Write an enzyme that holds these catalytic residues in place. Structure first.
Site, PDB file in Angstrom:
ATOM      1  N   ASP A  43     -22.234  43.800 -71.855  1.00 51.92           N
ATOM      2  CA  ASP A  43     -23.173  43.658 -72.971  1.00 51.92           C
ATOM      3  C   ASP A  43     -22.519  42.907 -74.147  1.00 51.92           C
ATOM      4  O   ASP A  43     -22.633  43.309 -75.312  1.00 51.92           O
ATOM      5  CB  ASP A  43     -23.724  45.029 -73.401  1.00 51.92           C
ATOM      6  CG  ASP A  43     -24.850  44.959 -74.426  1.00 51.92           C
ATOM      7  OD1 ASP A  43     -25.564  43.925 -74.460  1.00 51.92           O
ATOM      8  OD2 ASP A  43     -24.996  45.924 -75.208  1.00 51.92           O
ATOM      9  N   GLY A  45     -27.049  52.947 -82.820  1.00 53.22           N
ATOM     10  CA  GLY A  45     -26.591  52.253 -81.629  1.00 53.22           C
ATOM     11  C   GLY A  45     -27.670  52.336 -80.564  1.00 53.22           C
ATOM     12  O   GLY A  45     -28.794  52.774 -80.850  1.00 53.22           O
ATOM     13  N   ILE A 105     -24.463  53.603 -91.365  1.00 49.53           N
ATOM     14  CA  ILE A 105     -24.229  52.217 -90.947  1.00 49.53           C
ATOM     15  C   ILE A 105     -25.408  51.713 -90.142  1.00 49.53           C
ATOM     16  O   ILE A 105     -25.896  50.615 -90.398  1.00 49.53           O
ATOM     17  CB  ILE A 105     -22.884  52.068 -90.193  1.00 49.53           C
ATOM     18  CG1 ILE A 105     -21.723  52.086 -91.184  1.00 49.53           C
ATOM     19  CG2 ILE A 105     -22.854  50.792 -89.287  1.00 49.53           C
ATOM     20  CD1 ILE A 105     -20.326  52.178 -90.497  1.00 49.53           C
ATOM     21  N   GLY A 106     -25.893  52.531 -89.227  1.00 48.72           N
ATOM     22  CA  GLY A 106     -27.061  52.166 -88.430  1.00 48.72           C
ATOM     23  C   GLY A 106     -27.117  52.885 -87.101  1.00 48.72           C
ATOM     24  O   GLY A 106     -26.339  53.796 -86.865  1.00 48.72           O
ATOM     25  N   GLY A 126     -26.840  57.113 -80.330  1.00 45.83           N
ATOM     26  CA  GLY A 126     -25.885  57.491 -81.362  1.00 45.83           C
ATOM     27  C   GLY A 126     -26.144  56.820 -82.688  1.00 45.83           C
ATOM     28  O   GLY A 126     -26.696  55.723 -82.736  1.00 45.83           O
ATOM     29  N   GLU A 127     -25.830  57.523 -83.764  1.00 49.74           N
ATOM     30  CA  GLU A 127     -25.976  57.070 -85.149  1.00 49.74           C
ATOM     31  C   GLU A 127     -24.577  56.727 -85.611  1.00 49.74           C
ATOM     32  O   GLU A 127     -23.639  57.511 -85.382  1.00 49.74           O
ATOM     33  CB  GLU A 127     -26.493  58.234 -86.012  1.00 49.74           C
ATOM     34  CG  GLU A 127     -27.991  58.440 -85.958  1.00 49.74           C
ATOM     35  CD  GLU A 127     -28.687  57.670 -87.063  1.00 49.74           C
ATOM     36  OE1 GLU A 127     -29.294  56.618 -86.760  1.00 49.74           O
ATOM     37  OE2 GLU A 127     -28.556  58.074 -88.242  1.00 49.74           O
ATOM     38  N   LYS A 145     -19.425  57.534 -84.609  1.00 53.83           N
ATOM     39  CA  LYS A 145     -20.690  57.429 -83.880  1.00 53.83           C
ATOM     40  C   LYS A 145     -21.037  58.839 -83.387  1.00 53.83           C
ATOM     41  O   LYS A 145     -20.223  59.501 -82.712  1.00 53.83           O
ATOM     42  CB  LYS A 145     -20.591  56.443 -82.719  1.00 53.83           C
ATOM     43  CG  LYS A 145     -21.926  56.236 -81.982  1.00 53.83           C
ATOM     44  CD  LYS A 145     -22.050  54.821 -81.376  1.00 53.83           C
ATOM     45  CE  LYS A 145     -20.879  54.476 -80.489  1.00 53.83           C
ATOM     46  NZ  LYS A 145     -20.913  53.059 -79.989  1.00 53.83           N
TER      47      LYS A 145
HETATM   48  C1  LIG Z   1     -15.556  54.763 -80.683  1.00 52.09           C
HETATM   49  O1  LIG Z   1     -16.110  54.913 -82.003  1.00 52.09           O
HETATM   50  C2  LIG Z   1     -17.016  53.977 -82.446  1.00 52.09           C
HETATM   51  C3  LIG Z   1     -17.412  54.087 -83.776  1.00 52.09           C
HETATM   52  C4  LIG Z   1     -18.247  53.117 -84.312  1.00 52.09           C
HETATM   53  C5  LIG Z   1     -18.671  52.070 -83.487  1.00 52.09           C
HETATM   54  C6  LIG Z   1     -19.661  51.082 -83.976  1.00 52.09           C
HETATM   55  C7  LIG Z   1     -19.617  50.277 -85.094  1.00 52.09           C
HETATM   56  C8  LIG Z   1     -18.577  50.078 -86.119  1.00 52.09           C
HETATM   57  C9  LIG Z   1     -17.223  50.242 -85.834  1.00 52.09           C
HETATM   58  C10 LIG Z   1     -16.293  49.898 -86.806  1.00 52.09           C
HETATM   59  N1  LIG Z   1     -16.620  49.417 -88.020  1.00 52.09           N
HETATM   60  C11 LIG Z   1     -17.939  49.268 -88.293  1.00 52.09           C
HETATM   61  N2  LIG Z   1     -18.219  48.704 -89.562  1.00 52.09           N
HETATM   62  C12 LIG Z   1     -19.427  48.325 -90.090  1.00 52.09           C
HETATM   63  C13 LIG Z   1     -19.377  47.759 -91.487  1.00 52.09           C
HETATM   64  O2  LIG Z   1     -20.497  48.468 -89.506  1.00 52.09           O
HETATM   65  C14 LIG Z   1     -18.948  49.619 -87.380  1.00 52.09           C
HETATM   66  N3  LIG Z   1     -20.840  49.636 -85.243  1.00 52.09           N
HETATM   67  C15 LIG Z   1     -21.698  50.032 -84.236  1.00 52.09           C
HETATM   68  C16 LIG Z   1     -23.040  49.727 -83.986  1.00 52.09           C
HETATM   69  C17 LIG Z   1     -23.644  50.307 -82.869  1.00 52.09           C
HETATM   70  C18 LIG Z   1     -22.892  51.158 -82.062  1.00 52.09           C
HETATM   71  N4  LIG Z   1     -21.595  51.473 -82.302  1.00 52.09           N
HETATM   72  C19 LIG Z   1     -21.025  50.915 -83.392  1.00 52.09           C
HETATM   73  N5  LIG Z   1     -18.285  51.953 -82.202  1.00 52.09           N
HETATM   74  C20 LIG Z   1     -17.471  52.911 -81.692  1.00 52.09           C
END
Ligand SMILES: COc1ccc(-c2c(-c3ccnc(NC(C)=O)c3)[nH]c3cccnc23)nc1
Length: 304
Positions: free
Chosen positions: A136, A17, A14-15, A20-21, A35
């Site tokens: 943030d 943070g 996805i990308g 964290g990935e 993450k």
């Molecule tokens: C507690 O566990 C998490 C897991 C993932 C994220 C999280 C998500 C995330 C969440 C749900 N759905 C999606 N869906 C699409 C399509 O990206 C993306 N995007 C991020 C970008 C940067 C940092 N953290 C995140 N945060 C917290």
């Protein structure tokens, strides 16, 4: 062995943070967001796990936390956080891809304000919830659900309050968030970080900026503005604290409110909310609860 990370299969990157990935994964046949942090990022992982485990945090407009876990692949240990997965991803992504109806805009704004009001609210009792400030808030940190409503994410930089002693759970560092969305008092470092209310007020300023981003995408009679980040007209990409401070604090500018936003009641209500989040004096800003009330009264009127 464990029943979380052990049974999840990562499917798609996805990308990245702040740390964290982020991945899309499958758990018990369902899509989840994962993450992953390295061992040297344990402090960031633990703090985010701690915020998500706060008593009574769960709410329809706060990202649904599943679990914190570890996974040893045989060479290194990974520190995992798992949440619900939202196919639309961020509000930033959603607003770039689509325009919204008046109904669509109110759903996005109301859900965002409802999530922030829940974060900000202190709940008394045996299973009480401390008030939490985000620090943030931005469109890249808010996710859009299948039903067209938002949920607040990226809670890793949050601060929690203990009302009895008027103490904040961590020793807050100055200027931790995204520079573009920093409130005037944060930019010029006049914020009194010993008063928890100061953090809630700085979140409302950022929410006003997010409402401006949404309103630009509201299409009435095929008329709308293109997608832009707030201050796109005044600062470079990746602005410094100094660049933002000169614009927001010294020149005292805010995002431009177009004339066409006075032609429609929903856009007039949104534009008034923005002006009332953008006051240089944090104490003069609307509360998230007041915004939720105003938008709920508007949603009821529009028959959403
Ligand atoms: C507690 O566990 C998490 C897991 C993932 C994220 C999280 C998500 C995330 C969440 C749900 N759905 C999606 N869906 C699409 C399509 O990206 C993306 N995007 C991020 C970008 C940067 C940092 N953290 C995140 N945060 C917290």
């Amino acid at each position: 062995g464990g029943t979380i990370a052990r049974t999840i299969v990562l499917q798609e990157s996805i990308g990245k943070g702040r740390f964290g990935e982020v991945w899309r994964g499958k758990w018990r046949g369902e899509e989840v967001a994962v993450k992953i942090f390295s061992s040297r990022e344990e402090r960031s992982w633990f703090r985010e796990a701690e915020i998500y485990q706060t008593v009574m945090l769960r709410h329809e407009n706060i990202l649904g936390f599943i679990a914190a876990d570890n996974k040893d692949n045989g060479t290194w240990t990974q520190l995992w956080l798992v949440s619900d997965y939202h196919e639309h991803g961020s509000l930033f992504d959603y607003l770039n891809r689509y325009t919204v109806t008046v109904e669509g805009m109110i759903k996005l704004a109301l859900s965002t304000a409802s999530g922030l009001a829940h974060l900000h609210m202190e709940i008394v009792g045996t299973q009480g919830k401390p008030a939490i400030a985000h620090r943030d808030l931005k469109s890249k940190n808010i996710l859009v659900k299948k039903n067209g409503t938002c949920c607040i994410a990226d809670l890793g930089l949050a601060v929690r309050h203990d009302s009895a002693t008027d103490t904040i759970d961590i020793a807050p560092n100055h200027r931790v968030g995204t520079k573009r969305y920093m409130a005037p008092e944060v930019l010029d470092d006049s914020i009194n970080m010993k008063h928890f209310e100061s953090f809630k007020r700085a979140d409302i300023y950022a929410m006003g900026l997010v409402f401006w981003e949404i309103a630009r995408r509201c299409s009435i009679g095929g008329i709308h503005e293109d997608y832009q980040l707030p201050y796109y007209d005044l600062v470079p990409s990746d602005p410094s604290v100094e660049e933002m401070r000169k614009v927001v604090c010294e020149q005292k500018l805010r995002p431009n409110i177009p004339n066409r936003w006075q032609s429609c009641e929903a856009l007039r209500v949104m534009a008034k909310i923005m002006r009332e989040c953008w006051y240089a004096n944090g104490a003069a800003r609307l509360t998230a609860l007041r915004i939720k009330k105003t938008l709920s009264q508007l949603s009821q009127q529009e028959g959403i």
